[PDB]
Amino acid sequence: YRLINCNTSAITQACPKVSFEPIPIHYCAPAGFAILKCKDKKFNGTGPCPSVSTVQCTHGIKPVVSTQLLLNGSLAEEEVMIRSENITNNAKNILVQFNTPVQINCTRPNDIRQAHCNVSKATWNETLGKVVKQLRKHFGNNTIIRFANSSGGDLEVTTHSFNCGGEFFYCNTSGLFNSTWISDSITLPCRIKQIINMWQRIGQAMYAPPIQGVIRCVSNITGLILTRDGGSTTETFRPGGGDMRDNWRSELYKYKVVKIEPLGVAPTRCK
Amino acid sequence: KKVVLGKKGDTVELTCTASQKKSIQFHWKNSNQIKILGNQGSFLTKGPSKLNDRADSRRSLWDQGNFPLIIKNLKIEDSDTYICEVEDQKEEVQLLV
Amino acid sequence: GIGAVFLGFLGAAGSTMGAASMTLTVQARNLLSLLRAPEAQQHLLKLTVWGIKQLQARVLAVERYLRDQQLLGIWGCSGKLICCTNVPWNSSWSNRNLSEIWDNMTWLQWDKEISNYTQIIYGLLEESQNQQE
Amino acid sequence: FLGFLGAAGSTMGAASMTLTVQARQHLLKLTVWGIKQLQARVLAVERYLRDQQLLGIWGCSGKLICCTNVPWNSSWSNRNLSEIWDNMTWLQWDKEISNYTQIIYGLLEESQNQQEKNEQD
Amino acid sequence: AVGIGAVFLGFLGAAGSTMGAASMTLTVQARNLLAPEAQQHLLKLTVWGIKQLQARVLAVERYLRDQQLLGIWGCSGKLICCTNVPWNSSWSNRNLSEIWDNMTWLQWDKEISNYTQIIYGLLEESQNQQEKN
Amino acid sequence: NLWVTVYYGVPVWKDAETTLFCASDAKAYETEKHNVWATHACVPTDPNPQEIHLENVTEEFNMWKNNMVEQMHTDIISLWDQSLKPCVKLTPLCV
Numbered sequence: 114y115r116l117i118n119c120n121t122s123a124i125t126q127a128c129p130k131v132s133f134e135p136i137p138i139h140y141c142a143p144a145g146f147a148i149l150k151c152k153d154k155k156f157n158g159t160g161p162c163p164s165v166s167t168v169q170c171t172h173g174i175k176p177v178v179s180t181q182l183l184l185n186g187s188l189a190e191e192e193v194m195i196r197s198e199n200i201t202n203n204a205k206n207i208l209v210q211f212n213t214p215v216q217i218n219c220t221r222p223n224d225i226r227q228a229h230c231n232v233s234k235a236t237w238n239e240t241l242g243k244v245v246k247q248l249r250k251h252f253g254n255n256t257i258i259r260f261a262n263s264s265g266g267d268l269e270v271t272t273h274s275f276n277c278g279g280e281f282f283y284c285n286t287s288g289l290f291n292s293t294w295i296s297d298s299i300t301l302p303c304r305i306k307q308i309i310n311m312w313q314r315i316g317q318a319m320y321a322p323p324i325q326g327v328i329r330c331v332s333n334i335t336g337l338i339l340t341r342d343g344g345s346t347t348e349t350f351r352p353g354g355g356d357m358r359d360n361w362r363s364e365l366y367k368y369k370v371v372k373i374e375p376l377g378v379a380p381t382r383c384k
Numbered sequence: 385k386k387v388v389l390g391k392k393g394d395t396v397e398l399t400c401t402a403s404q405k406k407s408i409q410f411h412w413k414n415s416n417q418i419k420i421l422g423n424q425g426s427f428l429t430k431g432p433s434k435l436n437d438r439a440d441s442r443r444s445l446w447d448q449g450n451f452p453l454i455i456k457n458l459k460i461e462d463s464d465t466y467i468c469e470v471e472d473q474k475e476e477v478q479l480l481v
Numbered sequence: 482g483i484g485a486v487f488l489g490f491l492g493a494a495g496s497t498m499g500a501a502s503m504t505l506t507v508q509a510r511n512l513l514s515l516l517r518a519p520e521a522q523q524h525l526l527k528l529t530v531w532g533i534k535q536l537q538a539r540v541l542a543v544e545r546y547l548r549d550q551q552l553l554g555i556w557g558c559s560g561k562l563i564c565c566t567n568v569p570w571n572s573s574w575s576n577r578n579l580s581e582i583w584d585n586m587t588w589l590q591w592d593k594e595i596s597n598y599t600q601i602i603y604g605l606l607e608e609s610q611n612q613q614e
Numbered sequence: 615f616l617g618f619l620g621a622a623g624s625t626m627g628a629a630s631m632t633l634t635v636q637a638r639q640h641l642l643k644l645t646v647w648g649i650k651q652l653q654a655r656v657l658a659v660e661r662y663l664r665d666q667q668l669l670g671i672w673g674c675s676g677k678l679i680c681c682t683n684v685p686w687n688s689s690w691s692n693r694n695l696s697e698i699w700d701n702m703t704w705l706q707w708d709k710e711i712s713n714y715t716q717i718i719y720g721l722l723e724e725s726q727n728q729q730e731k732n733e734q735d
Numbered sequence: 736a737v738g739i740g741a742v743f744l745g746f747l748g749a750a751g752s753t754m755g756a757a758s759m760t761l762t763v764q765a766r767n768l769l770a771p772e773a774q775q776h777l778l779k780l781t782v783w784g785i786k787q788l789q790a791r792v793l794a795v796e797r798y799l800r801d802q803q804l805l806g807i808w809g810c811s812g813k814l815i816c817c818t819n820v821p822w823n824s825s826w827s828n829r830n831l832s833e834i835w836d837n838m839t840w841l842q843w844d845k846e847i848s849n850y851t852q853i854i855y856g857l858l859e860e861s862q863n864q865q866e867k868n
Numbered sequence: 869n870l871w872v873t874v875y876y877g878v879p880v881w882k883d884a885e886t887t888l889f890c891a892s893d894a895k896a897y898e899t900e901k902h903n904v905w906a907t908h909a910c911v912p913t914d915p916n917p918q919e920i921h922l923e924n925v926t927e928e929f930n931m932w933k934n935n936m937v938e939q940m941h942t943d944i945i946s947l948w949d950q951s952l953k954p955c956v957k958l959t960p961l962c963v
C-alpha cells in the first residue's frame with residue numbers, strides 16, 4: 114500500500130538497425146478552423162501579439178529531440194530571444210533561440226563506442242556573448258554571469274544526448290559552458306550508449322550494437338535550454354533540459370488554433 | 385509544516401503527492417531556494433546544492449503521482465526545510481537528525 | 482475547394498462592423514473563388530490512403546457549409562448574406578447607442594458582448610419564423 | 615446534409631421536436647472500406663440537394679417544418695388530428711397514406727404555381 | 736458524374752428553341768431529374784473508386800458555387816426569379832415581343848454579353864440596399 | 869424599432885481545442901523510418917497555401933499553455949514506437 118510491488122516487465126521485440134532522418138512535419142487545422150501565426154519579432158511567447166496573420170498550416174517543423182540543445186530547429190529574425198514561463202522562479206527551463214546556427218560537426222571516426230562532436234570556437238564565444246547581452250536585460254547588468262556544467266541526474270540530461278543515423282550519442286558538453294562574463298575548434302568526448310533511458314515513458318531500453326561504417330552528423334544548433342540557481346550573487350546558468358515538450362515549445366510558440374464562427378446577430382433599423 | 389526526524393546516515397523518504405497518476409513535473413527546493421532534485425519529463429535531474437551527490441528518488445513511483453525524495457548519509461547540516469512544488473501545492477517538510 | 486472560403490471570412494477582422502459588412506459584399510464575390518505518376522503495387526494502396534484522406538476533407542468542407550445554411554434556413558433566410566428578420570431587438574441585450582456599435586467596435590467585441598444572450602436570440606429566431614408560419 | 619437523421623424516432627411529438635433540435639496488407643481493409651464510407655456521405659449530400667430542389671418548387675426550401683395552403687381531401691385517411699400526434703409512429707404514416715402522396719405532391723405544385731402568378735398580378 | 740453532372744448537361748436541352756419554350760421546361764426538368772479476376776476487382780474498388788468520387792464532389796461544388804451566386808442576388812433556389820433592378824433601355828434597345836417570341840438564348844446572349852458584368856453588379860447592390868434599410 | 873439581423877460571413881473567433889491533422893511531403897517508397905510513418909498517418913503538403921494578413925488586430929497568445937504542443941508530443945511517441953523498435957524494453961508496470 115506504500116511499498117507496492119512494481120513488476121518491471123521486459124518486452125522484447127524484433128530489432129533491426131533502421132535509418133533515422135527526421136523530415137519536417139507541419140500541423141494543419143481541419144475545415145472550419147484556422148491557425149493564427151504571430152508575426153511579431155520581439156515576441157517573448159506570452160502577452161498581446163500585435164501583428165497576427167492567419168495560416169492553416171505551420172512551417173515544416175522537424176521533430177528533433179535532444180537535451181541541453183535544440184538541433185536543426187528554426188531561427189529568430191532580430192536577436193537572441195530568451196523565453197520562460199516565470200523568470201525569477203529558478204524552477205523553469207529558460208528557453209533560448211539563436212538567430213545564427215552554431216554548426217556542429219559530429220562523426221564516429223575510424224573503440225566502437227566513441228565519437229566526437231566538433232563545434233567552431235568564437236562562433237560559440239560570440240553566441241555565448243549574444244546571450245549574456247540579452248540576459249542582463251532581465252538583471253541589473255551586473256552580478257557576474259558564470260556558466261558552468263550540469264549538476265547531475267540521469268546521463269541523458271547531464272550530457273547533450275541525441276541520435277544521428279540510429280545510434281544514441283551522449284556528448285559531454287563541458288567545454289561549452291565554462292566561462293564567466295565580467296561587466297582552433299572545440300572537441301567534445303561523445304559516447305554511443307546502448308542502454309538508454311527512454312524519454313517517451315518511464316523505462317530503460319537496450320538496443321543493438323552500433324553500425325560498422327562511418328556515422329556523420331551535420332546539425333545546426335538553433336537553441337539552448339539553461340537553468341539558474343538562486344543563491345543569496347552571480348546567477349549561475351547550469352544548462353539542462355529533457356522534458357521533450359520544451360523542444361516543441363520552441364517551434365510552436367507563434368501559433369494558436371481558433372474556431373471560426375461565421376454567424377453573427379446585431380440590431381439594425383431595417384424592416 | 386510536516387515533521388521528519390532521522391538519526392544519521394539513514395534513508396529518509398520525504399513525500400509530496402499529487403492526484404493525477406500521470407507523471408507531472410515537480411521539483412524540490414530548500415529554504416534558500418536552491419534546487420535539490422527535479423523531474424524533467426521522464427528523466428531525473430539534480431541541482432547544485434550541497435545534497436547533489438546524496439539525494440535520490442524512486443523512479444517507478446512517478447507514474448502513480450508519488451514523488452518522493454530519498455536522502456543518504458544524513459549529516460547535521462541538512463537539518464533545514466524542504467519544499468516540493470508539484471503545480472501549486474508548495475508543501476514544506478522540515479528535517480532534523 | 483470550399484475550405485478556402487471558410488477562412489477568407491477572417492480578412493475583415495480588426496476593422497469596424499460597418500466597414501466589415503461592406504467588405505463582406507466584396508468578399509461575397511471573393512467567396513465565389515492530381516496524382517498521375519507510375520504507381521507500383523506498393524504505391525497503389527499508399528497513394529490511395531492519400532486520396533481518401535484529402536477527400537474526407539473536401540466533403541467535410543461541403544457538409545459543414547450545408548450545416549450552416551440549414552441553420553440559416555430555419556431563421557427565414559437561406560442563402561442571404563445580410564439578412565434581417567421580423568424579431569424586435571430587446572433592450573436587455575447589452576443596450577448601447579447604434580452609433581456606439583457600428584462605428585467604434587470590431588466584430589470580436591460582440592463575441593465578448595452578447596455571448597451570454599446568443600442562445601436566447603436563436604430560440605427567438607426559430608419561434609418567430611415558426612409563429613409566422 | 616442528412617441521409618439518416620434517425621435518433622430513433624418513435625413518438626411523433628417527440629419526433630417533431632427532436633427533429634428541430636438534432637438536425638438543426640492491412641491497408642486494403644481500410645481503403646476499400648473508407649471509399650464505401652465516402653460513397654455514403656457524397657450520396658447523402660446529393661440526396662439533400664435533389665430534395666431541396668423539390669421543396670423549392672413547392673416553396674418550402676430550407677425550412678424543415680413548413681406549413682402550406684392545401685387542405686385534406688375526404689379520402690386522405692380521415693382520422694382525428696389530436697390522437698394522430700398522440701399514439702402513432704412516423705412509420706405508420708406511409709402505411710396509412712399509400713397512393714395519396716403522389717397527388718399531394720401534385721397539388722403542392724399548383725398551390726405554389728398559382729401563387730406565383732397571383733402575386734404577379 | 737453519376738450525381739449532379741447530368742443536371743448541368745440536361746440544362747442544354749432545348750437550345751435553339753424560343754426563350755418561352757426553355758422557360759416552360761425549367762421547373763419541370765428539375766422535378767423529374769437530379770470479371771473473374773481478383774486484380775481488376777481491386778482497382779475497381781480502390782483507385783477507380785476514388786477517381787469517380789473526385790468527380791462527384793466536383794459536380795457538387797460546381798453546383799453550390801452557382802446557388803451561392805444566386806444567393807447574393809437574393810433568389811437562392813428559385814429557378815425563375817425577378818428583381819427590383821430596372822431594365823436600362825440602352826441594353827440592346829430591342830422590342831419585348833421581338834425578344835421573347837423569335838430569339839434563341841444563344842442568339843440572345845450574344846447580344847447582351849457586352850455588359851453582363853454591369854448587370855451583375857447592380858443585382859448585388861440592390862440586394863445590398865434592400866436589406867440595408 | 870430596431871430588428872434583429874443575422875449575418876453570415878463574419879470573422880468571429882472562439883477559443884477551443886481540436887485534433888489537428890498532420891501534413892508533410894513523404895515519398896511513399898523510402899524505407900527511411902520517418903517517410904514510413906508519414907505515409908500511414910499524414911497527408912500530402914499544401915500545394916497552394918492560403919495565408920491572410922489581418923489588419924489592426926491585437927491578440928493575446930500563450931506559449932506555456934498551448935494545446936497543440938501536447939498534440940505534437942503524442943504523434944512523436946507514436947512515431948518512435950513504430951520507428952525505433954528496441955531489443956529489450958523495461959517498462960515498470962506498478963500494479
Ligand SMILES: *[C@@H]1O[C@H](CO)[C@@H](O[C@@H]2O[C@H](CO)[C@@H](O[C@@H]3O[C@H](CO[C@H]4O[C@H](CO)[C@@H](O)[C@H](O[C@H]5O[C@H](CO)[C@@H](O)[C@H](O)[C@@H]5O)[C@@H]4O)[C@@H](O)[C@H](O[C@H]4O[C@H](CO)[C@@H](O)[C@H](O)[C@@H]4O[C@H]4O[C@H](CO)[C@@H](O)[C@H](O)[C@@H]4O)[C@@H]3O)[C@H](O)[C@H]2NC(C)=O)[C@H](O)[C@H]1NC(C)=O
Binds near residue numbers: 177325326328
Ligand atoms: C539535422 O539535419 C541533417 C539533414 O540536413 C541531418 O544530417 C543527416 O544525418 C544523417 C545521419 O548521418 C545522414 O544519413 C546518413 O548519411 C550518411 C552520409 O551519406 C552522405 O554521404 C555519402 C558518401 O558521400 C553519400 O553516398 C550519401 O548519399 C546518400 O544520400 C542521398 C540523399 O542525400 C541518397 O539519395 C543516396 O541514395 C545516398 O544513399 C550522402 O550524401 C550515409 O552513410 C548514411 O547511409 C548509411 O547509414 C544508414 C544508417 O545510418 C543506413 O541505413 C544506410 O543504408 C547506409 O548504411 C550503409 O553505410 C553504413 C556506413 O555509414 C554502413 O555501416 C551500413 O552497414 C550500410 O553499408 C545515411 O544516408 C543524412 O545523409 C544527413 N543529411 C544530409 C547530409 O543532408 C542531421 O542528422 C540532423 N541532426 C540531427 C541531430 O538529427
Ligand SMILES: *[C@@H]1O[C@H](CO)[C@@H](O[C@@H]2O[C@H](CO)[C@@H](O)[C@H](O)[C@H]2NC(C)=O)[C@H](O)[C@H]1NC(C)=O
Binds near residue numbers: 200201203
Ligand atoms: C514567479 O516566481 C516567483 C518566485 O521566484 C513568485 O514570487 C513569489 O510569490 C509568492 C506569492 O505567494 C510570495 O509569497 C513569494 O515571496 C514570492 N517570491 C519571490 C522570490 O518573489 C511569483 O509569484 C511567480 N510569478 C507568478 C506569476 O506566479
Ligand SMILES: *[C@@H]1O[C@H](CO)[C@@H](O[C@@H]2O[C@H](CO)[C@@H](O)[C@H](O)[C@H]2NC(C)=O)[C@H](O)[C@H]1NC(C)=O
Binds near residue numbers: 285287
Ligand atoms: C566532461 O569533460 C570534463 C572536462 O575534463 C570532465 O570534468 C573533469 O575535468 C577535469 C579537468 O580539470 C579532470 O581532471 C576530471 O577528471 C574530470 N572529471 C571529473 C569527474 O572531475 C567531466 O568529468 C567529463 N564528463 C564525464 C561524464 O566524464
Ligand SMILES: *[C@@H]1O[C@H](CO)[C@@H](O)[C@H](O)[C@H]1NC(C)=O
Binds near residue numbers: 199
Ligand atoms: C513577456 O512579455 C510580456 C509583455 O509582452 C511581459 O508582461 C512578460 O513579463 C514577459 N515575460 C517574460 C518571461 O519575458
Ligand SMILES: *[C@@H]1O[C@H](CO)[C@@H](O)[C@H](O)[C@H]1NC(C)=O
Binds near residue numbers: 185331332333
Ligand atoms: C544549417 O543552417 C542554415 C542557415 O545558415 C540552414 O539554411 C540549413 O538548412 C541548416 N541545415 C540543416 C537544418 O540541416
Ligand SMILES: *[C@@H]1O[C@H](CO)[C@@H](O)[C@H](O)[C@H]1NC(C)=O
Binds near residue numbers: 299300
Ligand atoms: C575534429 O577536431 C579535431 C581537433 O580540432 C580534428 O583533429 C578532427 O579532424 C576534427 N574532425 C572533424 C570531423 O572535423
Ligand SMILES: *[C@@H]1O[C@H](CO)[C@@H](O)[C@H](O)[C@H]1NC(C)=O
Binds near residue numbers: 238239242292
Ligand atoms: C570571447 O570574446 C570576447 C570579446 O568579444 C573576449 O573578451 C573573451 O575573452 C572571449 N572568450 C574567451 C574564452 O576567450
Ligand SMILES: *[C@@H]1O[C@H](CO)[C@@H](O)[C@H](O)[C@H]1NC(C)=O
Binds near residue numbers: 262287
Ligand atoms: C563539469 O561537469 C562534471 C560532471 O558533469 C563535474 O565533475 C565538474 O566539476 C564540472 N566542472 C565544473 C567547472 O563545474
Ligand SMILES: *[C@@H]1O[C@H](CO)[C@@H](O)[C@H](O)[C@H]1NC(C)=O
Binds near residue numbers: 623625
Ligand atoms: C421509447 O418508448 C418509451 C416508452 O414510451 C419512451 O419513454 C421513450 O422515450 C421511447 N424512445 C424514444 C427514443 O423516444
Ligand SMILES: *[C@@H]1O[C@H](CO)[C@@H](O)[C@H](O)[C@H]1NC(C)=O
Binds near residue numbers: 752
Ligand atoms: C426550327 O425552325 C422553325 C422555323 O423557324 C421553327 O418553327 C421550329 O420550332 C424550330 N425547331 C424547333 C425544334 O424549335
Ligand SMILES: *[C@@H]1O[C@H](CO)[C@@H](O)[C@H](O)[C@H]1NC(C)=O
Binds near residue numbers: 848849
Ligand atoms: C461587344 O463586345 C465585342 C467583343 O466581345 C466588341 O467587339 C463590340 O464592340 C462590343 N459592342 C458594344 C456595343 O459594346
